């Protein structure tokens, strides 16, 4: 598909997918291994109503 | 697209021509709708009224008159800008380069402003031919209308020097999201502040009608809600004259079938409702991004579509 | 009867590719890391 | 000095290969001239 | 189809069990875009020549 | 046209799929013009902002912030809606559905929030996927503005109460506003927050000019010209309001800023700028309620 712009035209490509879990029961299991960093300061901030 | 060409004339040095290369996506005000035009009609030297450069309330009145055009492309001997006031009819959305500390979001109507921030301000000088270019600052209409109000009131408060002591309120500082925004306080000119005051005073009068008195009855009722709802509490700003205005029908109904409430709303809505627009230039564009990016960083190109 | 006939039509054609195979306990598994292969320069984060 | 710019032709006949693939907008300042062209741009031509 | 075991003594006798189920497809798509700058469309289509 | 294809979720009940089939020709507001959008993004459950479903004011805000797109074709596992804002003006005729008064051969329909008329009527719930759709009503600009002001006018009477605004005669017969019952209690409770911003912005506007005019022209051409054309109008209104009310350049100017903004924010919400026009041809020229009507992108 395509559309106009400042510059010039723009071509978006999309193909449809579809999917199903085969199997009865659990097929994948995931596990956490390490903690990299906190991402949050793990600190002192209050709340302000 | 009725593009208006703008001829770079003759001598243009390599450093100056490199300055115009990065001016694509910026905005120009042309004093006509033309096909052939001179580079000097766009320059800030053309904004000069008789003998005098307009102040920063004078520019708004100059940008009121003439037509905003967003530069699309710049060629060796011409500048192509399509006059948004007219030639906005493009299937997709001309690029606006966000020049501002601010950030557009998606759907924000974009009205322009003379450069007005302490840290910022784009004027690009060109030494080969005497001329300069101040590019207006695009800005959401909520913010651009807060600024104009600041400049208007500042020109009005400094007009009759304040009787009261010499320490006045700020009015020079805003906030958009976080990010304190400090306006430029520099000069105010009689004529520029007069018209801005003249049309402010004029319109706030026409918004008062017979049915308006029926509404002024409700001030004691508002403050009853000031205090028992968390909204309506927020509505009334702490510095609210209305709060100080309470610190009534008058019979006089002319035959009883007019509906002055309804008529009072319409009257107020026209004149007072449309004040951002008359004091400043109203939005003609609104950010729209096809790729689904939902903001525009400062300095980026904002895909822009016709009027909100 | 005749169930479990299932199917076995062909036997596709194969190529020997560079993989990392490990026997964990009793069974053979692909052991993988695929950032730097697909996610490398793309500025997409790795799931 | 203001960069002379990038030479687009003579970039068509490389003299060598870059062996890494990184996001170079991070390393933005290791160069005299730099541009990010997302897809295509009029300045290439 | 499920297995089964013969028990002995007072108990409810057991019958084979067959479970029949179905699943539907989850629908998706994948997007990528590119674009041509107007100078390029012009060189490309024909005219700037 | 730039169609944008909204993706129907996973399996929906057969009566719900028939609910959508009947939604072709209805206006949708799509948050971004991305070609691929979800249905939950469009559904009214996506208008929540402050943790609540938005009132008529909160809606009118959103209608001014997202993109309305008329629904062109509804397909199982898609919805194809073509945004009104994109493309050249006067092009992409797409059919609407008329609701309420007749859309004559022009007049620039505004899409105003649903609650202004039968409230829940048009909620169109989909239980299978647990979402809902409130489609705005396509009314002409003169009538849309007359109504929205007509109801906040009636909402001022109601605020404190001790000539009927409700019956609007619109070209044909009479149009009914009131659905009586408690619908008004539902209508009036949603205009509750719009009424206040209206009441406030008036009372805060007058008192701010009534304080400013006498606290200005007393400090040139300002004075003379002001009192000149204001004879028995501004000054008379000054004595009369100051009669039944109370009376600071520093708070004045800082309140004149905060009002001037809030005011124009209401003028933006209000005035219901037209999304489209009707320009017909080889057509009836009047679109009877509930009938698809031609329509074009700019007024």
UniProtKB/TrEMBL annotation, chain C:
The lineage of its organism: Viruses, Duplodnaviria, Heunggongvirae, Peploviricota, Herviviricetes. Coiled coil: none annotated. It comes from Human herpesvirus 2. It comes from the Viruses. This is Major capsid protein. The chain holds residues 347 to 393 of 1374 of the full protein. Transmembrane segments: none annotated.
TrEMBL record, chain D:
It comes from the Viruses. It comes from Human herpesvirus 2 (HHV-2). The chain holds residues 6 to 50 of 1374 of the full protein. This is Major capsid protein.
TrEMBL record, chain F:
The keyword Membrane does not apply. Pfam families: Herpes_V23 (PF01802). GO terms for cellular component: viral capsid. The keyword Metal-binding does not apply. It comes from the Viruses. Keywords: Capsid protein, Host nucleus, Virion. Disulfide bonds join 1-82. GO terms for molecular function: structural molecule activity. HAMAP family: HSV_TRX2. This is Capsid triplex subunit 2. It comes from Human herpesvirus 2 (HHV-2). The gene is UL18.
């Amino acid at each position: 598909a395509r559309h106009e712009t400042g510059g010039g035209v723009n071509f978006t490509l999309t193909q449809p997918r579809g999917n199903v879990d085969l199997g009865v029961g659990y097929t994948a299991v995931a596990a956490t291994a390490t903690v990299r960093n906190p991402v949050t300061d793990m600190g002192n901030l209050p709340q302000n109503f | 697209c009725f593009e208006a060409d703008i001829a770079i004339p003759s001598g243009i040095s390599r450093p100056d021509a490199a300055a115009l290369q990065r001016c694509e996506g910026r905005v120009v005000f042309l004093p006509t709708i033309r096909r052939q035009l001179a580079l000097a009609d766009v320059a800030h030297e053309s904004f000069v009224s008789g003998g005098v450069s307009p102040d920063t309330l004078g520019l708004l009145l100059a940008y009121r008159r003439r037509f905003p055009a967003v530069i699309t492309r710049v060629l060796p001997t011409r500048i192509v800008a399509c006059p948004v006031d007219l030639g906005l009819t493009h299937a997709g959305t001309v690029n606006l380069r966000n020049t501002s500390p601010v950030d557009l979001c998606n759907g924000d109507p974009v009205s322009l402003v003379p450069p007005v921030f302490e840290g910022q301000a784009t004027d690009v000088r060109l030494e080969s031919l005497d001329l300069t270019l101040r590019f207006p600052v695009p800005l959401p209409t909520p913010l651009a209308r807060e600024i104009v109000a600041r400049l208007v009131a500042r020109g009005i408060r400094d007009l009759n020097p304040d009787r009261t002591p010499g320490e006045l309120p700020d009015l020079n500082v805003l906030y958009y999201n976080g990010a304190r925004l400090s306006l430029v306080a520099d000069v105010q000119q009689l004529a520029s502040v007069n018209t801005e005051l003249r049309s402010l005073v004029l319109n706030m009068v026409y918004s008062i009608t017979e049915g308006t008195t029926l509404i002024l009855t409700l001030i004691p009722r508002l403050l009853a809600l000031s205090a028992q709802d968390g909204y309506v509490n927020a509505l009334l700003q702490m510095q609210s004259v209305t709060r100080e205005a309470a610190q009534a029908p008058m019979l006089m109904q002319d035959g009883e079938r007019r509906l002055p409430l309804y008529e009072a709303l319409v009257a107020w809505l026209a004149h007072a409702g449309q004040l951002g627009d008359i004091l400043a230039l109203a939005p003609a564009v609104r950010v729209c991004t096809f790729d689904g990016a939902a903001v525009v960083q400062s300095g980026d190109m904002a895909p822009v579509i016709r009027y909100p | 009867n005749r169930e479990t006939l299932d199917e076995l039509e062909s036997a596709p054609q194969t190529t020997r590719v560079r993989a990392d195979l490990v026997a964990i306990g009793d069974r053979l598994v692909f052991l993988e890391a695929l950032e730097k292969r697909i996610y490398a320069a793309t500025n997409v984060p790795y799931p | 000095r203001d960069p002379p710019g990038y030479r687009y032709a003579a970039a068509m006949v490389p003299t060598g290969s870059i062996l890494s693939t990184i996001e170079v907008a991070s390393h933005r300042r290791l160069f005299d001239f730099f541009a990010r062209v997302r897809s295509d741009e009029n300045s290439l031509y | 189809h499920q297995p089964l075991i013969a028990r002995d003594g007072p108990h409810p006798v057991e019958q084979p069990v067959h479970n029949y189920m179905t699943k539907v497809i989850d629908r998706r798509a994948l997007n990528a875009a590119f674009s041509l700058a107007t100078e390029a469309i012009a060189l490309l289509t024909g005219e700037a020549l």
